[PDB]
């Protein structure tokens, strides 16, 4: 589309004035832009992705909660009818958000997963994956709810399966996969003790395998096995 | 109130 | 355009809840639409059209200022050269920018102006046209910069000239006024003790006016004031 | 560094 012109080198560069900027819909653009080209993705870049679609959608995330809240407060007895626009403009909201998740898989899909071959790139998509899938089922009430569902977990259990084998306990991308596949568990999946186990036995390999680290990977690693504990202590 | 998920690093 | 089709109400209900939800640009487009309607906007609505367009142009000015710091840092002795892309992004964000300014002069030109004739709406909608002026003039540099700077200036002496025969001056409109007119003279016209003459001048009628409000109205009044000092201690 | 303006309110 609109970036087809514009040089893979000048869309990344234009990425991260995006990101100074606090431009994060420019940056996704963007980061589109450079995956159209159809080169496979540094680390950097990579990351340059993820930083613009996850705030893209984190606004959007916020605004629908926001909105699902007074249309609940709406549905209550006792509740003065307010017409239909409430309702609408949830569902305005929820469109958009839905079109950024497909946004997002499309590109997976078209070509970023099957491309990729070291556990650190194929690891991190299919964690995007799970993710995405798992926004689209925060807003799912319909008959493909189940199937939404099913669809983030097969995509965390691949990355699972690969991380546990290709990566060490440390590993960044694999904590940061296992604290989400955790958050699915308990927000999603109705499996609270399925997401303590997980984020427990992550949290304690982790633990063991840190005094192989460097003093700036270990930063690293703690930074994420501090979000495991933080969650361990709001579930038990 | 929600779990807390990878944050942007 | 997109919201002909919706009801003046509807659209007056969807702004709230898009400030409630934070979505500033959706909030622009709904008071757009109420203004498109060709009815009189009372002082509730007044404020929602202020809100939502000063939020949407607060992030392009704020995006714009930390591209040209960019910008003026490429262009010094030392700095390597690196292409164009910091200046053409700076000038994709600019020109949304200044066509944000120009949908608010547009609106306030067909035909709200025209039409307010009570003090409160016609010294509003004057401050709003200098201050979207003011927003043009930051980033303006070519052979129009003098006339915009102009624009500006006349838009606010309208208003300062209505406000001081009209209102008392403990006016929150009146105050706010006076205190951008100050912001215009020291950071747009290089008139640094004309801004100071007329934030002491104002601060000082305001404290002497202050006995005759409610307790309410005083903590309105008080709120502009300590604007009106915070700058005098920055420029003084 | 820069003046205020006034705010939203
Ligand atoms: C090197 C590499 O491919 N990447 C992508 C990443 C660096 C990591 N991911 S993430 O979602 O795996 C993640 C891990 C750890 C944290 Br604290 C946050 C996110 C995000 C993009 O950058
Ligand atoms: C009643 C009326 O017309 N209005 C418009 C306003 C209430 C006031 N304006 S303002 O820009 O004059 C302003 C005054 C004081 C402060 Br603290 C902030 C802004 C903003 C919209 O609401
Ligand atoms: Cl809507
Ligand atoms: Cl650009
Ligand atoms: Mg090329
Ligand atoms: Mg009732
Ligand atoms: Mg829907
Ligand atoms: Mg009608
Ligand atoms: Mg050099
Ligand atoms: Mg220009």
């Not at chain 1, 540094?42 to 984190?58: D, F, T």
Request: proline share 2%.
């Amino acid at each position: 589309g609109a970036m087809g012109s514009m040089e893979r080198a000048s869309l990344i560069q234009k990425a991260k004035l995006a990101e100074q900027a606090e431009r994060y819909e420019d940056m996704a653009a963007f980061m589109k832009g450079a995956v159209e080209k159809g080169e496979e993705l540094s680390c950097e870049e990579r990351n340059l992705l993820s930083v613009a679609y996850k705030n893209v959608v984190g606004g959007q995330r916020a605004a629908w909660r926001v909105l699902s809240s007074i249309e609940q407060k709406s549905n209550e007895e006792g509740s003065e009818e307010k017409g239909p626009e409430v309702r609408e403009y949830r569902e305005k909201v929820e469109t958009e958000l839905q079109g950024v998740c497909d946004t997002v898989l499309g590109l997976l899909d078209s070509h970023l997963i099957k491309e990729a071959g070291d556990a650190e790139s194929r690891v991190f998509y299919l964690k995007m994956k799970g993710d995405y899938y798992r926004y689209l089922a925060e807003v799912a009430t319909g008959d493909d709810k189940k199937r939404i569902i099913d669809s983030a977990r097969s995509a965390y259990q691949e990355a699972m399966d690969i991380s546990k084998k290709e990566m060490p306990p440390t590993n960044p991308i694999r904590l940061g996969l296992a604290l989400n596949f955790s958050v699915f568990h308990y927000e999603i999946a109705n499996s609270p003790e399925e997401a303590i186990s997980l984020a427990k036995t992550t949290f304690d390999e982790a633990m063991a395998d840190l005094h192989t680290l460097s003093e700036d990977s270990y930063k690293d690693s703690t930074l994420i096995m501090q979000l495991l504990r933080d969650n361990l202590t709001l579930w038990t | 109130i929600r779990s807390t998920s990878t944050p942007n690093v």
